[PDB]
C-alpha cells in the first residue's frame, strides 16, 4: 500500500524548488510520485533541477503537461514567469485527460498555489484530494486568504492602514506586495482568485514547523475547523535533496580557506536582479563593512538572458578592486551547501521563504533586505523568531536606494549580533527535531499519508 | 501496492556491497526495503557504506539484529570475517521476534549466501519466500551446491582431478578455495551447509547478466525446474549507488591529468592483504612495466588495524622511489569511480566478483591474479568472457610468490591486449542492455516483484 501522489508545477524557481524537495520527501516516506511538468521552462535552472531529480530518483514519473498556444498580447505584465503561470492556467481543461491516463490511480493531487484557482476544479471533478503547495510563509498565506475580502470591503484603492489577519499580527499595506496595489495587474487578480480558492482545498501545505511560528498553529487549526476551513499542514523545513550537495565547487573551495563565522553571504534569490547603482553601492558597502563576503550577482531577471559582465556593469577596475576583499560571482551557486558551510556567519537576503528556511535549517543569522512581493511579510516572521533583523528604513529594494555607508555599517552590526546566533542554534535544533520521528512535520506528514492511506 | 522486502546481512565488504546496491535498486523499483544490520562491523567501510545508504535513502528502514555473546575460543579460525558470520549464525533463533515486529508485513526475506543454512528455517516457520543473495559467480554457486556431494563421495581427502559442474565447465581442485581442502575448517563447514540449503529457497539472486555467461543460463534454469530446484535469478549488473561517485576525490584528480587508457589499476579487494615480499616484488613490477598506475595497498586484513605505513614495510627510499612512477595509496578508495575514469586502461585484480562486475560494467580489461577463495573460478569465468586474462603459472597468491619481472612483463601484455578492449566495449554494452527495459535482468527483477505481488 504505497499511495500515489501527483504534483502540479507552474514556473519560477521560487515555486519549483520546494516542489521537488517535497516530492523527494514523499518518495522518502513510502509514496509513489508523479510530477506534471511543462516545457519549455522560463529558466534553465528549472530544467536542470528536474533532470537532476529524475536522475537521482528514477522511481519518480514525469508527465509533460502540453499547454495551449499562448498569446502574450493580452497579459498586462512582461514578467515571463507570471506569463508562463498564466499560460498554464488558461489550459486547465487540458490537465484533466492527462490526469486520467496516470496509472496506478492517484490518491492526492498537490497543486502549486499560483495555479490553484484554475486547477482546483480539475481535481474536484476527478474526486481527488487536492492540496495547496504554498511556497511562502504562513502569515503570507493568511494574507492571501484575507486579501480578497479586503479589496471587496473597499470602494477603490488607501493610506497605510491595517488589514486584519486572523491568528497573526496585522499587516500594514506597506508590507503588502507593491504590484498588488493596482487591481488590474495579472499577479493581483491571480493572487485574489487563488486566495479565494484555497478554502476549496483539503489541506494547505506550508514549508514550516510549529516552533518557528511561535506555537500559534494548533490553535489556529481547530479555530479553522470550526469555520470549515482547510488545516495548515506544517511539513517543513523541507530538506534539500541529495544532489544539491556538490562538495567540490569553486565557492566552497574558497569558503574552506576562511575562518568560521567571518564570511557574509549575499544572494537575492534567482528571480530578482538589482539595479546598476544599487549594485555599485552594494559593492562599496561590502568593502566598507570590513568583513569577508560571498556575493552572488544578477543583472537580468531570467538567467537565460543575463550575459553581460560586471566589467560592463561596475567596470573593470572596480570589480578588480572588490574581488580582493572577498568572492564575487555572477553565476548559479548552491545556497544550501554554502549556508551549511562553517565559514558563513550571516546572510544578506531578499527575504524569499526558500532562502530564509534554508538559513533557518543551517542556523545562519539573516539581514533581511526586501525587494518585492511577500518578502516584507517574511521579514517580520523571521524577525519575530529572533534569527534575523531587517532595516525598515530601507523599505522596498525596488523602490528605494541604499548607499554603501549604511550597508557596511549595518553588516558590521550583523556580524556582531550574538543573540541572533544564540537563537540560530536553538532554532536549527528545533527545526531538526521537527522533522525527526515524533516531530511536528513528521506527525503532520504521517497523518497526511495515513489518510491516503 | 509496494512489496515490503527485507534483507539480512553478514560480515565482509564483498558481501555487504551487493546487499546494499540491490536494496537500492529495489527501492528504485517501488519496493519497501528494510535492512537488518549487526554491529559492530569488522571493517569500518561497512559501517560507512551502510550510513551512506541510509543517508541517501531515508525510506530504507534499518533493523539492528542484536547477536548473542560470542566465544571465539571454540572456532578454528582467526579470520575476523568468518568469526563474525559465525557469531551471527549462532544467534539464528532470535531473528524470529525481530522479524515479527516488522511493520508493514513482509513480502520476502533476502538472505546472504553465507547465512542461509542457519536462517532459512526461520522464514519457513513464518511462511516467507526466502531468497539467496549470492555475491559470487553463477558457476561458483553451482560449485557450492555440488561440493557437499563431492566431499560425501570421498572416503578421505585427493589429487588434482575435477569436480563436475552441471551446465558449466568442470572445476579442478586447483581452482577450489584452498581452505576448503581441509574439512574441519569453519568456513568449509559453512560452505558445505550453505550450498546444501540453497535448494530450499524460492530463488537464487545472482549479480550477473545472461549475455555474460554465454547465454547458457535458461537451459540450466529449465533443467533446474525439472529437478525441483529454485531458479538462478540473474539481476545484474547491480548498479553502483549515487554516493559511490565523489567527483572530487584525491586520486580522481590525479587520473584527470593522465592520458586515457594508460593507467593500470591494481587492487585486491578489501578483505585481503598481500605479503611483504610480494608487495615489494609488486612495487618492483609496477615500475618495471613502463605504465602509469594507481596502486591501492593493504598491509593488514581489517582496515581498522592497518595503521602502519609503507615506509615501515617497503622503506622510505623505496616508496619515495615508487611514488615517482605511479600513484601509491594505503587507504580506502572509490573503485567504481576509478574504473569509470577515462584514464584507466586495465585492472590488476584478485578475482573478487564485485570488482570483476564493476570492471565489466565500466568495460575495463582485467589481469586476474587469484589470491584465495573463489577467485580462480571467477578467473576462468572472466577469461572465457573475453574481457580479462589470468596466468595459471602464478597459481594462488597466498601460495606462490610472483617476482617483479613477470609481473611487469605480464602487465605490459595486459595493456597491449586489443581483443580484451573490443570485447570490453561489446560486453559493457551487453551489460547495459540487460538492465534497460526489456533486458534480461529487467524482465527477471520485474518478474520477481510481480510474484510478491
Ligand atoms: O544563486 C543562487 C540563487 C538562488 N538559489 C536558490 O534559489 C532559491 C531562492 O528562492 P526564493 O523563493 O527564496 O527567492 P525568489 O528568487 O524566488 O524570489 C533558494 O532555495 C536557493 O537555493 C541558488 O541556489 N543559487
Ligand atoms: O580500496 C578499495 C578496496 C575495495 N573497494 C570495494 O570493495 C569491493 C571489492 O569486493 P570483492 O568481493 O570483489 O573482493 P573481496 O570481498 O574479496 O575483498 C569493490 O566493490 C570495491 O568497490 C573499494 O571501494 N576500495
Q: Are B144 and B165 in contact (CB under 8 A)?
A: no
Distance CA(A172)–CA(A178), nearest Å, equals: 12
Chain B positions with Cβ closer than 8 Å to A:
1-2, 27-30, 32, 55-59, 104, 242-243, 246-248
Distance CA(B322)–CA(B164), nearest Å, equals: 45
Phi-psi region of B296 (alpha: psi -120 to 50; beta: other; left: phi over 0): beta
Phi-psi region of A100 (alpha: psi -120 to 50; beta: other; left: phi over 0): alpha
Classify residue B297 by burial, with Cβ atoms within 10 Å: 0-12, 13-18, 19+: buried
Contact between chains at B32 and A242 (C-beta distance less than 8 A): no
Based on the fold, state whether residues A106 and A171 are members of the same structural domain: yes
Residues facing residue B368 across a β-bridge: B349
- Residue whose C-alpha cell reads 581483443 in the numeric block: B419
Residue in B310, B402, B296 with CA at minimum distance from that of residue B347: B296
Based on the fold, state whether residues B226 and B270 are members of the same structural domain: no
Distance CA(A392)–CA(B198), nearest Å, equals: 73
Q: Are B93 and B65 in contact (CB under 8 A)?
A: no
Interface test with A, best of B2, B52, B105, B252 (most A CBs within 10 A): B2
Distance CA(A45)–CA(A303), nearest Å, equals: 8
Distance CA(A363)–CA(A431), nearest Å, equals: 9
Instruction: Return the SS3 of B133.
Output: strand
Going by DSSP bridges, is the β-strand pair B388-389/B366-368 parallel, antiparallel, or unpaired? Answer: parallel
Residue in A285, A427, A297 with CA at minimum distance from that of residue A356: A427
- Residues of B labelled as active-site residues: 15, 112
CA distances from A242 to A21, A55, B135, B242 (A): 10, 11, 28, 9
Cα–ligand 1 centroid distance for A81 (angstroms): 14
Q: Are B24 and B58 in contact (CB under 8 A)?
A: no
Report which DSSP code applies to A107: S
Going by DSSP bridges, is the β-strand pair A171-172/A162-163 parallel, antiparallel, or unpaired? Answer: antiparallel
Classify residue A293 by burial, with Cβ atoms within 10 Å: 0-12, 13-18, 19+: buried
Non-local (6+) Cβ contacts of B438 within 8 A are none
Based on the fold, state whether residues B54 and B42 are members of the same structural domain: yes
Distance CA(B238)–CA(B206), nearest Å, equals: 9
Mutual orientation of helices B186-197 and B80-89 as an angle, nearest 10°? 50
Q: Which three cell numbers stand for residue A10?
A: 507552474
Mutual orientation of helices A418-435 and A353-362 as an angle, nearest 10°? 90
Q: Are B199 and B417 in contact (CB under 8 A)?
A: no
Q: Which three cell numbers stand for residue B377?
A: 573460478
Ligand 2 cavity residues, CB under 6 Å: B 12-14, 17, 267, 269-272, 296, 332-336, 352-355, 358
Q: Which three cell numbers stand for residue B278?
A: 610480494
Residue in B302, B396, B321, B355 with CA at minimum distance from that of residue B310: B321
Based on the fold, state whether residues B260 and B202 are members of the same structural domain: no
Q: Are B177 and B191 in contact (CB under 8 A)?
A: yes
b/e burial code for range B217-249 (CB count within 10 A of at least 16 → b):
beebbeebeeeebbbbbbbbbbbbbbbbeeeee
Secondary element (H or E) of residue B344: strand B344-349
Based on the fold, state whether residues B218 and B290 are members of the same structural domain: no
- After which residues are there C–N gaps above 2.5 Å in chain B? 157
Return the best residue to mutate from B10, B13, B295 for the ligand 2 pocket (most ligand atoms within 8 A of CB): B13
Distance CA(B335)–CA(B358), nearest Å, equals: 8
The CA-CA-CA angle for residues B41, B47, B48, to 5°, reads 155
Distance CA(A329)–CA(A316), nearest Å, equals: 14
Q: Would you tell me how many other CB atoms lie within 10 Å of the CB of residue A426?
A: 14
Q: Would you tell me how many other CB atoms lie within 10 Å of the CB of residue B353?
A: 28
Going by DSSP bridges, is the β-strand pair B204-206/B130-134 parallel, antiparallel, or unpaired? Answer: parallel
Distance CA(B265)–CA(B348), nearest Å, equals: 6
CATH number for the domain harbouring residue B273: 3.40.50.2000
Based on the fold, state whether residues B323 and B188 are members of the same structural domain: no
CA distances from B90 to B67, B84, B114, B129, B130 (A): 8, 10, 13, 22, 19
Helix (H) and strand (E) counts in chain B? 18, 15
Instruction: Return the SS3 of A205.
Output: strand
Instruction: Return the SS3 of A439.
Output: coil
Q: Which three cell numbers stand for residue B321?
A: 622511489
DSSP letter for each residue of A368-432: E---STTHHHHHHHHHHHTSEE--GGG--TTT----HHHHHHHHHHHTT-HHHHHHHHHHHHHHH
Residue in A272, A301, A295 with CA at minimum distance from that of residue A375: A272
Distance CA(B442)–CA(B448), nearest Å, equals: 10
Interface test with A, best of B25, B51, B53, B58 (most A CBs within 10 A): B58
Residue in B47, B1, B58 with CA at minimum distance from that of residue B24: B58
Contact between chains at B247 and A243 (C-beta distance less than 8 A): no
B169 phi and psi, to 5 degrees?
A: -70, 150
Based on the fold, state whether residues A98 and A201 are members of the same structural domain: yes
CA dihedral angle for residue A162, residue A165, residue A167, residue A172, rounded to 10 degrees: -40
Distance CA(B440)–CA(B447), nearest Å, equals: 11
Secondary element (H or E) of residue B149: helix B138-153
Contact between chains at B28 and A58 (C-beta distance less than 8 A): yes
Q: Which three cell numbers stand for residue B127?
A: 511462511
Classify residue B33 by burial, with Cβ atoms within 10 Å: 0-12, 13-18, 19+: buried
- After which residues are there C–N gaps above 2.5 Å in chain A? 157
Q: Are A186 and A133 in contact (CB under 8 A)?
A: no
Altogether, the residues listed in chain A come to a count of 453
Classify residue A331 by burial, with Cβ atoms within 10 Å: 0-12, 13-18, 19+: exposed
Cα B346 to chain center, whole Å?
19
Classify residue B317 by burial, with Cβ atoms within 10 Å: 0-12, 13-18, 19+: exposed
Based on the fold, state whether residues A220 and A353 are members of the same structural domain: no
Based on the fold, state whether residues B417 and B291 are members of the same structural domain: yes
A118 pocket-lining for ligand 1 (C-beta < 6 Å):
no
CA dihedral angle for residue B161, residue B164, residue B165, residue B170, rounded to 10 degrees: 40
The CA-CA-CA angle for residues B414, B419, B425, to 5°, reads 100
Q: Would you tell me how many other CB atoms lie within 10 Å of the CB of residue A143?
A: 24
Mutual orientation of helices A138-153 and A186-197 as an angle, nearest 10°? 100
Range of the domain at B337: 250-430
Distance CA(A186)–CA(A84), nearest Å, equals: 12
Distance CA(B40)–CA(B30), nearest Å, equals: 30
CA distances from B144 to A285, B113, B124, B137, B165 (A): 74, 10, 22, 10, 10
Based on the fold, state whether residues B194 and B326 are members of the same structural domain: no
HEC profile of B209-269? CCCCCCCCHHHHHHHHHCCCCCCEEECCCCCCCHHHCCCCCHHHHHHCCCCCCCEEEECCC
Experimental technique for the deposited model: X-ray
Distance CA(B400)–CA(A339), nearest Å, equals: 56
A295 phi and psi, to 5 degrees?
A: -120, 115
The CA-CA-CA angle for residues A212, A216, A217, to 5°, reads 85
Non-local (6+) Cβ contacts of A365 within 8 A are A345, A346, A347, A359, A387, A388, A389, A414, A417, A420, A421, A423, A424
Distance CA(A389)–CA(A398), nearest Å, equals: 19
- Residue whose C-alpha cell reads 580506502 in the numeric block: B332
Cα–ligand 1 centroid distance for A119 (angstroms): 26
Tally of domains within chain B: 2
Chain A residues inside the 8 Å CB shell of B446: none
Distance CA(B356)–CA(B379), nearest Å, equals: 9
Q: Are B347 and B363 in contact (CB under 8 A)?
A: no
Based on the fold, state whether residues B261 and B198 are members of the same structural domain: no
CA distances from A50 to A18, A24, A46, A122, B401 (A): 12, 12, 6, 24, 54
A221 pocket-lining for ligand 1 (C-beta < 6 Å):
no
Distance CA(A385)–CA(A299), nearest Å, equals: 32
Non-local (6+) Cβ contacts of A121 within 8 A are A92
Based on the fold, state whether residues A185 and A219 are members of the same structural domain: yes
Q: Are A293 and A261 in contact (CB under 8 A)?
A: no
Q: Would you tell me how many other CB atoms lie within 10 Å of the CB of residue B196?
A: 16
Q: Which three cell numbers stand for residue A216?
A: 500559534
Peptide bond into A40 cis (omega under 30): yes
Distance CA(B55)–CA(B299), nearest Å, equals: 31
Distance CA(A110)–CA(A132), nearest Å, equals: 6
Chain B residues inside the 8 Å CB shell of A27: 59
Instruction: Return the SS3 of A346.
Output: strand
HEC profile of B45-64? HHHHHHHHHHHHCCCCEEEE
Nearest atom, ligand 2, residue B12 CA: 16
Distance CA(B79)–CA(A61), nearest Å, equals: 47
Residue in B86, B91, B96 with CA at minimum distance from that of residue B67: B91
Q: Are B302 and B270 in contact (CB under 8 A)?
A: no
Cα A370 to chain center, whole Å?
13
A270 pocket-lining for ligand 1 (C-beta < 6 Å):
yes
Amino acid at each position: 500500500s504505497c499511495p500515489h501522489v501527483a504534483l502540479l508545477l507552474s514556473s519560477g524557481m521560487g515555486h519549483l524548488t520546494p516542489c521537488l524537495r517535497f516530492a523527494a520527501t514523499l518518495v522518502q516516506h513510502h509514496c509513489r510520485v508523479t510530477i506534471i511538468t511543462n516545457y519549455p521552462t522560463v529558466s534553465v535552472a528549472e530544467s536542470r533541477a528536474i533532470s537532476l531529480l529524475l536522475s537521482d530518483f528514477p522511481q519518480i514519473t514525469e508527465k509533460q503537461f502540453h499547454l495551449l498556444p499562448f498569446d502574450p498580447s493580452t497579459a498586462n505584465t512582461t514578467d515571463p514567469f507570471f506569463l508562463r503561470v498564466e499560460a498554464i492556467r488558461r489550459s486547465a481543461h487540458l490537465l484533466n485527460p492527462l490526469l486520467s491516463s496516470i496509472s496506478p490511480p492517484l490518491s492526492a493531487l498537490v497543486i502549486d498555489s499560483s495555479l490553484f484557482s484554475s486547477f482546483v476544479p480539475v481535481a474536484a471533478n476527478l474526486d481527488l484530494p487536492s492540496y495547496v503547495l504554498f511556497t511562502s510563509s504562513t502569515r503570507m498565506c493568511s494574507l492571501e486568504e484575507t486579501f480578497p475580502a479586503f479589496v471587496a470591503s473597499k470602494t477603490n484603492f488607501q493610506l497605510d492602514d491595517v488589514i486584519e489577519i486572523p491568528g497573526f499580527s496585522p499587516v500594514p499595506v506597506s508590507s503588502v506586495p507593491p504590484v498588488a496595489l493596482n487591481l488590474n495587474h495579472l499577479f493581483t487578480t491571480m493572487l485574489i482568485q487563488n486566495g479565494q480558492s484555497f478554502r476549496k482545498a483539503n489541506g494547505i501545505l506550508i514549508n514550516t514547523f510549529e516552533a518557528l511560528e511561535g506555537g500559534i498553529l494548533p490553535g489556529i487549526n481547530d479555530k479553522r475547523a470550526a469555520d470549515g476551513l482547510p488545516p495548515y499542514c506544517s511539513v517543513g523545513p523541507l530538506l534539500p535533496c541529495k544532489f544539491e550537495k556538490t562538495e567540490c565547487s569553486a565557492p566552497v573551495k574558497w569558503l574552506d580557506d576562511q575562518p568560521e563565522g567571518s564570511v557574509v553571504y549575499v544572494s537575492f534569490g534567482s528571480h530578482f536582479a538589482l539595479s546598476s547603482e544599487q549594485i555599485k553601492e552594494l559593492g562599496d558597502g561590502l568593502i566598507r563593512s570590513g568583513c569577508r563576503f560571498l556575493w552572488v550577482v544578477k543583472c537580468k531577471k531570467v538567467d537565460q538572458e543575463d550575459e553581460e559582465s560586471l566589467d560592463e556593469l561596475l567596470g573593470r577596475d572596480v570589480l578588480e578592486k572588490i574581488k580582493k576583499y572577498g568572492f564575487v560571482i555572477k553565476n548559479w551557486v548552491n545556497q544550501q551547501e554554502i549556508l551549511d558551510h562553517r565559514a558563513v556567519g550571516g546572510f544578506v537576503t531578499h527575504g524569499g521563504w526558500n532562502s530564509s528556511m534554508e538559513a533557518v535549517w543551517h542556523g545562519v543569522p539573516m539581514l533581511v533586505w526586501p525587494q518585492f512581493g511577500d518578502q516584507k511579510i517574511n521579514a517580520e516572521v523571521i524577525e519575530r523568531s529572533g534569527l534575523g533583523m531587517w532595516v525598515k528604513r530601507w523599505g522596498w529594494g525596488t523602490q528605494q536606494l541604499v548607499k554603501g555607508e549604511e550597508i557596511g555599517e549595518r553588516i558590521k552590526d550583523l556580524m556582531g549580533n550574538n543573540p541572533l546566533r544564540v537563537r540560530a542554534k536553538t532554532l536549527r535544533e528545533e527545526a531538526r527535531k521537527a522533522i525527526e520521528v515524533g516531530g511536528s512535520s513528521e506527525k503532520t506528514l504521517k497523518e497526511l499519508i495515513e489518510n491516503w492511506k
